[PDB]
Amino acid sequence: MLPALIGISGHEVGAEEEAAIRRLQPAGFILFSRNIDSVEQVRGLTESLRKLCLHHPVIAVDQEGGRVVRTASLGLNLPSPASLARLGSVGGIVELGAVTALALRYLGVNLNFAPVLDICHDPSAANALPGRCWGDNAQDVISRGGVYASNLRRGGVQSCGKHFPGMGRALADPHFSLPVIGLDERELFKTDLLPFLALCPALSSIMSAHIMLPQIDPDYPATLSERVIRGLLRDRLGFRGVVFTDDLCMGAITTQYSPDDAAFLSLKAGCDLPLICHDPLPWLDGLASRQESLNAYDRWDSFKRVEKLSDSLCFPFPEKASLWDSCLRRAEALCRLEEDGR
């Protein structure tokens, strides 16, 4: 099993991808809008991915709501987390989790890269994609994100808290290539790290971002730092689940490492499943070869975490048109609940 999630180019698995999957057996896949055109087409894609894998593959997506939604071609839209936070509706948060879980399960998706546990500390901070945050302080994020994660998992879809160690505090720094968090660790555990600690039972996994924590490790970003991942995340935060990396194929991380070297470094640092989202095939064989150079006990530890995640994955609902109709109906009413509250 290749320890990574890889992306898929289109509506069906192509010839190069299928050959690489059979040969290398990636732990799973991440889907984007380019993979999602119709219900029948998506269920066929996820069925193909499961059939090509000996293990039960992670099949993941970023179905957050608002501007991070991958199902527009199906007519399935969802309100943003921030809008449901402004609405103050507790039932609306429950329903976002319940409806997301129901719809992803009908599509054969088994993991959702949510909740975002980043804190929107000031309404003046970075808003590249606005509306992704559940609140402006740790306690509101924990309450709202915890209700969300509970009802996503109640519906059988695995959750992922992101982005460790907390993007709300990350700032540009002309002394570094990547965003930087200069906070002391003690202050971090009182604020941006607190949602990850408080929600460990509700988080199937955690995704780490390519952020510099210079007071902990000034040479490697969090995803590639043994001191951040094994020290801060595993030892002091105590998280025992699967750790994903943010995409290694786009962004400033690519100006310093190619994706194959980056993925290997993240495994060595203690991550379990690096993300190779876009044009992954050139990078996989170098990773599969380098991975035999990892500490065998660390590899065994990571494999048991991935195997535990794999055993918790759910299979798609049996075909039933009225079930999908209810997904659309409930998704639409959820958007209307929010619009009527503005």
Ligand SMILES: [Cl-]
């Ligand atoms: Cl292909």
Ligand SMILES: [Cl-]
């Ligand atoms: Cl459809």
Ligand SMILES: [Cl-]
């Ligand atoms: Cl919004």
Ligand SMILES: [Cl-]
């Ligand atoms: Cl806070």
Ligand SMILES: [Cl-]
């Ligand atoms: Cl844990």
Ligand SMILES: [Mg+2]
């Ligand atoms: Mg369509």
Ligand SMILES: [Mg+2]
């Ligand atoms: Mg399988």
